[PDB]
Design a protein around this ligand. Structure first.
Ligand SMILES: O=S(=O)(O)OC[C@H]1O[C@H](O[C@H]2[C@@H](O)[C@@H](CO)O[C@@H](O[C@@H]3[C@H](O)[C@@H](OS(=O)(=O)O)[C@@H](O)O[C@@H]3COS(=O)(=O)O)[C@@H]2OS(=O)(=O)O)[C@H](O)[C@@H](O)[C@H]1O
Ligand SMILES: [Cl-]
Ligand SMILES: [Cl-]
Ligand SMILES: [Cl-]
Ligand SMILES: [Mg+2]
Length: 577
C-alpha cells in the first residue's frame, strides 16, 4: 500500500500530480494533501479519449485519473482544489474501493455569463444587461459576446438562458428557458451591453440571467466520473463549479454521498454551481445512499438514478441481437456484459416481458452493440423492441438532504428496486419528485416498483412557467407502444408538508397503486398562480389510487381532476373537499 503526500509547492500542481500518479505500482493507494489551496491547469495534464454518459465524448484533459486500483483514497483534509479551463478533475475507473473526503472543488473562472437585466424593449427586439464582474470573464469581438475566453476557448453564443432572482439566487417565479443566439451586441459604456435579438419570452427587469454556452460543447466533463467501481464513498466533498455534472456514476455499485454538496460559495458573486446534474447514477447497482447533503444552484437535476433503454436493430442468430443507443450522448456507454440479466420489451407492450442472461458482448462501435445470450432469444423479438438491463439497477435512499434554488426537478427516480426519500427539505422550480420513463428521446429506463416518499418538507415547489407538480408521474414513451398501459407501480407519498402558492401537488399518469396519505398542504406562499384552476391532484389512466387523511389549509383550490378509468379504482376518504 502506497501513501503519497503533497504540499502546495508550485503554482500549477498538475505536473506534480501527473508524474507521481504515473509511477504508482501497488493496487492500494492513498493520497493526502496538507490543507491548502491547490491550483490545477490543463496545459500539462494527461489527455485520453473518454466516453462520458449524458456528456460529450472526446479527448479530455484529466487532472486526477485513477484506474485499476483495489482501493484508492484521497484525503483532502479541508483543502480547496481550484481548476482552470476545460478539464476533468477526477476519474475513478475500475476500482474495487473509492473514497474521497474533505475537499472543495471550484474554478478560477467559471464557464458562465451572468448579467443583470436593466431594460427590455419587445417592440425593437433588444435587452440591456450589465454583466456581473466577480471572477467572470468576457469581452466583445465581431459584434458578438465571447466568454469565458479561457485558454483560447469561447462559446459561439450565450446558449440556453434563464432568469434568476438577484436576492435569493433562485429561478424567478414563472421563469422559463430562454435561448439566446444574438449576433449583434453593442457596448454602451457603463459596463452595459445591448443584446439585439427578438426573444420568445424576455427576462424580467432586475433578474439575473444565466448562460451556460453552446449546447454542443458545454458538457465537457463532470467534477467526478466513477465508472465500473464498487464501494465508493464521498464524505464532506463540496463542488462549487464543474463543466458538467457534479457526481456522475456509470455502472458502479454501493455508492455513498455523505456530508457532501454542490452549491455556491458564500460571499461570492457566482450564480450557478454546476452546469448540469448535481448527482447522476447511470445503470448502477447495489445500494445508493445520499445523506446529510446539500445541492443548490445547479443548471439541472439534483439527482437522477436511471438505466439505459437500447433499441433492437437486427437479429443476428437464435442467441445474438444487435442493439443501438437512442440518445447521442449515450453512445459509448458500457451497456452490459457477461452474466448480466436483461429485460426484453416487445412493441407495443411497455411491460418487461422476459429475462435472459448475457454470455458475451461484441461492441461494434459506440452506437451499436452485439449481445450473445446464454438462452434462446424471444421468438417475437423484432426491430424496434427494447432491451433493459435487469442486473444494473440500484436501491436508492436520500435522507436528511437539502435540494433547493436550481433549474430542474429535485429528484428523478427511475429504478425498479426499493427507493426511500425521507426527511428531506425540497424546493424546485420544476417538479420536485419526477418519474419519467423515456423511450421517445432520452431512452432512460426505470419503470419503478417500490418507492416511498415520507416525512419530507416541500417549500416553494413548481413555480416554473411550464406546468409541474410536487409529485409528477409522467412517462413519455414511443408511439410504437400503447400510450395507456400501466407503467409505474407501488408509489407512496406519506406524511409530507407542502407549502403551496397554488401549484399542483400530484400529477399521475399510468400509475398502478398510488397512496397519498398523511400530507398537510399549506397555502401560505404569497406568489401569483401561473396556471389558473389547476387541481391539487390529477390522475389519468391509472389504477388503485388512494387519498387518505390529507389536510389542506388556505384559500380554496380545485381538488381533483380524474379520468373515468382511474376513478373506478380511486379511494377518496374526503379528507380534502
Ligand atoms: O427523461 S428526463 O428525465 O425528462 O430527461 C433526462 C435528461 O435530464 C437532464 O437534462 C434535461 C432536463 O433538464 C429537462 C428538464 O425538463 O430539460 C432538458 O432540456 C430539453 C432540451 O435539451 C432543451 O434544449 S437545449 O438543447 O438544452 O438548449 C430545451 O428544449 O428544453 C428541453 C426540455 O425541457 S422543458 O420541456 O422546456 O422543460 C434537459 O436536457 S439537457 O439540459 O440538454 O441535458 C439531464 O441533464 C440529461 O442528461 C438527461 O438525464
Ligand atoms: Cl510537466
Ligand atoms: Cl472511456
Ligand atoms: Cl394530516
Ligand atoms: Mg456521452
Amino acid at each position: 500500500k502506497e501513501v503519497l503526500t503533497f504540499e502546495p509547492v508550485a503554482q500549477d500542481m498538475t505536473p506534480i500530480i501527473r508524474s507521481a500518479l504515473k509511477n504508482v505500482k501497488d493496487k492500494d493507494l492513498k493520497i493526502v494533501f496538507k490543507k491548502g489551496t491547490y491550483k490545477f491547469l490543463p496545459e500539462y495534464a494527461s489527455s485520453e479519449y473518454r466516453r462520458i454518459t449524458n456528456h460529450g465524448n472526446g479527448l479530455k484533459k484529466i487532472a486526477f485519473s485513477l484506474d485499476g486500483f483495489d482501493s484508492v483514497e484521497i484525503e483532502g483534509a479541508g483543502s480547496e482544489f481550484v481548476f482552470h479551463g476545460q478539464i476533468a478533475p477526477f476519474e475513478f475507473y475500475n476500482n474495487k474501493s473509492v473514497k474521497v473526503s474533505n475537499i472543495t472543488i471550484d474554478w478560477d473562472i467559471p464557464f458562465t455569463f451572468v448579467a443583470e437585466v436593466l431594460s427590455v424593449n419587445e417592440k425593437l427586439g433588444y435587452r440591456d444587461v450589465r454583466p456581473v464582474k466577480g471572477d467572470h470573464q468576457w469581452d466583445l469581438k465581431g459584434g458578438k459576446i465571447r466568454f469565458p475566453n479561457v485558454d483560447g476557448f469561447s462559446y459561439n453564443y450565450l446558449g440556453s438562458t434563464l432568469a434568476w432572482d438577484k436576492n435569493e439566487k433562485r429561478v424567478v417565479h414563472g421563469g422559463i428557458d430562454s435561448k439566446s443566439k444574438s449576433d449583434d451586441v453593442e457596448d454602451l459604456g457603463n459596463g452595459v451591453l445591448r443584446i439585439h435579438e427578438r426573444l420568445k419570452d424576455y427576462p424580467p427587469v432586475g433578474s439575473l440571467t444565466s448562460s451556460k454556452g453552446d449546447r454542443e460543447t458545454h458538457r465537457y466533463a463532470p467534477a467526478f466520473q466513477v465508472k465500473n467501481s464498487k464501494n465508493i464513498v464521498f464524505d464532506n466533498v463540496v463542488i462549487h463549479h464543474a463543466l458538467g455534472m457534479g457526481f456522475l456514476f456509470e455502472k458502479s455499485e454501493d455508492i455513498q454521498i455523505l456530508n457532501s454538496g454542490v452549491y455556491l460559495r458564500d460571499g461570492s458573486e457566482r450564480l450557478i454551481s454546476t452546469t448540469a446534474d448535481a448527482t447522476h447514477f447511470a445503470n448502477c447497482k447495489g445500494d445508493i445512499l445520499i445523506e446529510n447533503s446539500r445541492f443548490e444552484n445547479m443548471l439541472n437535476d439534483g439527482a437522477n438514478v436511471h438505466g439505459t433503454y437500447t433499441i433492437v436493430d437486427k437479429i443476428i442468430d437464435s442467441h445474438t441481437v444487435m442493439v443501438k443507443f437512442g440518445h447521442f450522448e449515450q453512445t459509448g456507454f458500457e451497456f452490459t456484459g457477461q452474466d448480466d440479466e436483461i429485460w426484453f420489451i416487445h412493441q407495443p407492450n411497455t411491460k418487461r416481458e422476459s429475462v435472459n442472461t448475457v454470455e458475451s458482448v461484441n461492441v461494434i462501435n459506440e452506437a451499436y452493440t452485439q449481445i450473445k445470450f446464454k438462452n434462446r432469444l424471444p421468438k417475437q423479438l423484432a426491430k424496434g423492441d427494447l432491451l433493459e438491463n435487469k442486473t444494473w439497477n440500484p436501491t436508492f435512499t436520500m435522507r436528511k438532504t437539502i435540494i433547493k434554488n436550481h433549474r430542474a426537478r429535485n429528484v428523478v427516480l427511475k429504478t425498479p428496486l426499493k427507493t426511500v426519500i425521507e426527511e428531506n427539505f425540497f424546493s424546485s422550480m420544476m417538479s420536485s419528485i419526477l418519474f419519467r420513463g423515456e423511450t421517445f428521446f432520452w431512452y432512460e429506463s426505470g419503470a419503478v416498483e417500490d418507492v416511498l416518499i415520507r416525512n419530507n418538507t416541500f417549500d416553494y415547489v413548481a413555480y416554473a412557467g411550464k406546468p409541474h407538480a410536487v409529485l409528477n408521474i409522467t412517462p413519455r414513451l414511443s408511439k410504437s407502444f400503447n400510450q395507456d398501459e400501466i407503467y409505474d407501480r407501488n408509489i407512496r407519498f406519506e406524511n409530507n408538508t407542502i407549502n403551496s402558492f397554488g401549484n399542483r401537488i400530484v400529477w399521475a399518469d399510468r400509475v398502478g397503486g398510488l397512496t397519498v396519505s398523511g400530507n398537510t398542504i399549506n397555502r401560505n406562499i404569497n406568489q401569483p398562480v401561473l396556471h389558473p384552476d389547476s387541481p391539487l391532484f390529477e390522475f389519468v389512466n391509472s389504477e388503485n389510487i388512494e387519498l387518505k387523511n390529507n389536510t389542506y389549509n388556505g384559500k380554496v383550490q380545485r381538488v381533483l381532476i380524474v379520468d373515468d378509468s382511474s376513478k373506478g379504482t380511486l379511494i377518496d376518504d374526503g379528507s380534502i373537499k
